[PDB]
Amino acid sequence: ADYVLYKDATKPVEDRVADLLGRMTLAEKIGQMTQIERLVATPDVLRDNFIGSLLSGGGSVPRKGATAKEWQDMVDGFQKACMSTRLGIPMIYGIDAVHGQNNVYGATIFPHNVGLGATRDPYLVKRIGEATALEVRATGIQYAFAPCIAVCRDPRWGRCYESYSEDRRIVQSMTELIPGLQGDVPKDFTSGMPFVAGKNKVAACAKHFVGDGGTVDGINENNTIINREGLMNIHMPAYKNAMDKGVSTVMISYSSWNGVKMHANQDLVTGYLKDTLKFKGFVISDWEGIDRITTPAGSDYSYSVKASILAGLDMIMVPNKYQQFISILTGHVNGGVIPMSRIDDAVTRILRVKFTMGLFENPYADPAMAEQLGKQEHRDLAREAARKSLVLLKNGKTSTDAPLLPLPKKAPKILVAGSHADNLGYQCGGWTIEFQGDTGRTTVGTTILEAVKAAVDPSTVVVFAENPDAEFVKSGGFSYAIVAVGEHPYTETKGDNLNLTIPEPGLSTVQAVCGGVRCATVLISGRPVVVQPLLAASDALVAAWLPGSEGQGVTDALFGDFGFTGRLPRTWFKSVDQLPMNVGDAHYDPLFRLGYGLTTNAT
Ligand SMILES: CO[C@@H]1O[C@H](CS[C@@H]2O[C@H](CO)[C@@H](O)[C@H](O)[C@H]2O)[C@@H](O)[C@H](O)[C@H]1O
């Protein structure tokens, strides 16, 4: 009697979309296109403005240390308000689960993407997507702003660690994250259609469209200076692979392509992504990305709304001034500046994703999934990934020396040292707990020092000293040392760095240690950094990138349980004066070329 077709789970998605769209008011439509921060959301706001989506931006959590159930109860509280609207359209909640569900205390933290590139193991990355989707659903969240498919062309960019590689082919291969997060697409699948398998999967997001990895001087907020040919040949291809794998959403770059702001680029967003690649999911802005269309940012927000929505963006990550956004867009539609056809297209795409993914059938969190958070199988996977990511750059000072690695687990006394040997937050890097990461024991994990203590024979005495002097080392009766140093956590706008040298004490500790005893240096970094001096001092040196919460991945290789297999996914420069300098360039003079990596055999 009271049958409503969009509420019928047995109906085809396109019929449900069209049935719902035909019923919606303009307020209901513009609400769907609006994404807000949890920080500004209340039940009344969500209901009264018919809100379509929420997010947690970096560090946006219900409280420090919050359990999986606390996150579920948060998300469900917001959902209950959404489901209480006239039409009962469930919100989608988005988060940056970019190396695990990394805002959440106790989530497994996987290596960052640059290290995943070093594994050259797309099936490993798919399995990471799988595990990540489980840990995201453990917290009640249904959408991950991942993968970042940037092709970072200059390691001075502060997000270079979010790129699998400077080589688009490796980036393309690691789009296997998508069917991990979302599920494998049907055999009959049409490229560009969105797909999510159901309540144990999440919607994914290929980001940031397009050429975010190309930006002049590394910088971003900035211009990506190259022609159609290098756009199409370097920066774009992985977006086609993402279409073929049913990526549900695409996020637009803050960047510009040849002086045109991506958030205002109709030719690329509508002409290419939608009309040429036949993308049928939704296009989301970046954080205040429409604001940044103008200079200064936010100085003509009316223009920002007109320009972005006419360019083809579907959902706007406001994320705070939702009343201004909705008011302005409403005015634009009432005035005929934005046609109803454009609103209807945006809403069609958002609804298409929501229906496809089963969000109308399972709008609420599954309490039984809470135990997927930080689950030990997932940590075992992260430990495998971390080990596979390690690139061995040196293993002996001369070709006649005994190879230092693998180290024996049985020795009378060994030294573990360095700023990075017992600091979980430094080993995770940015996008861990906080936006910019943090120092010290910020989540559940195993530092390098703890990993060493867990690996060695019970007779081996392990001494830790963060920054020992040369005399301490020479007097200590050590068999060897493991010294871990490197970069502090960062994101784009502390991490855009011109000198790329590691902070002190880092080199000075390696010199003091290695001057006294043979030493294996573990370099923790988001990118290649100035390395000759560290190499000169070290018997062995490993580029461990940002390996995440499972430090036993490092020791699994140091102690020979597995052989080193990682290969550089980026060029290692001799000097920052050379940059940009990528594989295949004409003037190509690397310290280590892309693909370089020494090996060991398991003992
Ligand atoms: C600096 O202010 C903080 O910015 C971060 C990153 S900006 C933008 O954020 C999106 C949603 O988190 C990410 O998917 C995207 O990759 C980033 O470019 C933001 O997360 C914080 O919320 C904001 O305080």
Author numbering: 0 to 602
Provide the authors' original text about this structure.
In the barley β-d-glucan glucohydrolase, a glycoside hydrolase family 3 (GH3) enzyme, the Trp286/Trp434 clamp ensures β-d-glucosides binding, which is fundamental for substrate hydrolysis during plant growth and development. HvExoI folds into a two-domain structure consisting of an (α/β)8 barrel (domain 1) and an (α/β)6 sandwich (domain 2) with a 13 Å-deep active site pocket embracing the subsites −1 and +1, positioned at the interface between the two domains. HvExoI catalyses the hydrolytic removal of nonreducing glucose (Glc) moiety from a broad spectrum of poly- and oligomeric β-d-glucosides. The crucial role of substrate binding in HvExoI implies a pair of the aromatic Trp286 and Trp434 residues that form a clamp at the +1 subsite, which is positioned next to a pocket-shaped site at the −1 subsite, housing the Asp285 and Glu491 catalysts.
